[PDB]
Amino acid sequence: MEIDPKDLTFLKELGTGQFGVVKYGKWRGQYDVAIRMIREGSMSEDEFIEEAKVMMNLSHEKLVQLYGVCTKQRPIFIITEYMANGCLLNYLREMRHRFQTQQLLEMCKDVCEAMEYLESKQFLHRDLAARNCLVNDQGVVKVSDFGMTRYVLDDEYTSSTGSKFPVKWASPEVLMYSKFSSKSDIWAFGVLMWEIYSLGKMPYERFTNSETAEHIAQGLRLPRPHLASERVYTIMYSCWHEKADERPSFKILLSNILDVMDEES
Ligand SMILES: Nc1ncnc2c1c(-c1ccc(Oc3ccccc3)cc1)nn2[C@@H]1CCCN(C(=O)C2CC2)C1
Numbered sequence: 674m675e676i677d678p679k680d681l682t683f684l685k686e687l688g689t690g691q692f693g694v695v696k697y698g699k700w701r702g703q704y705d706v707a708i709r710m711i712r713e714g715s716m717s718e719d720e721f722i723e724e725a726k727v728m729m730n731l732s733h734e735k736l737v738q739l740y741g742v743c744t745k746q747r748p749i750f751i752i753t754e755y756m757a758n759g760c761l762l763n764y765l766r767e768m769r770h771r772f773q774t775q776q777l778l779e780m781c782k783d784v785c786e787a788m789e790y791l792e793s794k795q796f797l798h799r800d801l802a803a804r805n806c807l808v809n810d811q812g813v814v815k816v817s818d819f820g821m822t823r824y825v826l827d828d829e830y831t832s833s834t835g836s837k838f839p840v841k842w843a844s845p846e847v848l849m850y851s852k853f854s855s856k857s858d859i860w861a862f863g864v865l866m867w868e869i870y871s872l873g874k875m876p877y878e879r880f881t882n883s884e885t886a887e888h889i890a891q892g893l894r895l896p897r898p899h900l901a902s903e904r905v906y907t908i909m910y911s912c913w914h915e916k917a918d919e920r921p922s923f924k925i926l927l928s929n930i931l932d933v934m935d936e937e938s
Contacts, residue, residue: 735787756807765873789923801861863912
């Protein structure tokens with residue numbers, strides 16, 4: 674819903690992100706919130722606003738809840754749930770030896786649940802990666818920056834050959850056909866699981882983007898992480914089938930995850 678800045682407070686700077694500056698603050702006094710001030714010239718604003726209204730109506734425990742926006746001024750403000758531990762990539766790296774495989778599988782269950790809810794709303798992420806996931810005060814992982822890439826103006830960020838495109842999270846049909854689907858979000862989720870169990874290593878760290886794309890096209894798949902059991906690897910590997918229809922939905926994935934977690938008890 675629209676928010677009157679009268680009801681917001683700026684209390685601390687959290688840093689500038691990929692899609693504009695972000696600050697920590699309080700909404701209506703009692704609500705811990707993270708206020709993003711969108712950059713200017715980066716997004717198709719009207720379209721972006723309408724999609725913001727759609728992502729505002731999305732609610733789920735494992736989705737960074739969106740509380741509102743301030744759009745009748747510029748820069749647009751986006752008021753979101755405050756995730757105290759920041760991006761999942763750095764949470765993974767700072768607490769590298771501070772994790773047990775039970776916690777890793779939990780973070781994957783968290784993400785998979787959020788993506789199964791996004792799947793059921795016919796809403797695509799288009800850029801699922803650890804750098805777009807956040808961690809709260811209790812250690813739970815939640816997805817964020819979902820659907821943001823549909824409205825980015827920089828063609829480097831959007832085109833298949835753009836210098837900033839996340840090829841290393843992209844399915845073959847996204848690199849070759851630009852055919853984003855829930856199956857491409859599933860491929861990306863597979864890569865994300867690999868990030869988690871790798872404790873935040875860059876997939877295909879030393880391959881150039883082109884080299885990665887071609888290797889993927891010819892059958893290359895990420896190596897089983899050291900911290901991944903053969904069952905976890907089987908699960909993240911099923912996301913990376915060459916044929917899109919052969920990949921399991923997020924629901925079937927969540928079921929497999931809970932079966933393995935139960936057997937990991
Ligand atoms: N909420 C938050 N809490 C805490 N830090 C947050 C954030 C957001 C954020 C704000 C608004 C959002 O708007 C959305 C939400 C969902 C979908 C689309 C847009 C989505 C995310 N960004 N940052 C930080 C910003 C700079 C770098 N960061 C670090 O941690 C540094 C230590 C590495 C993360």
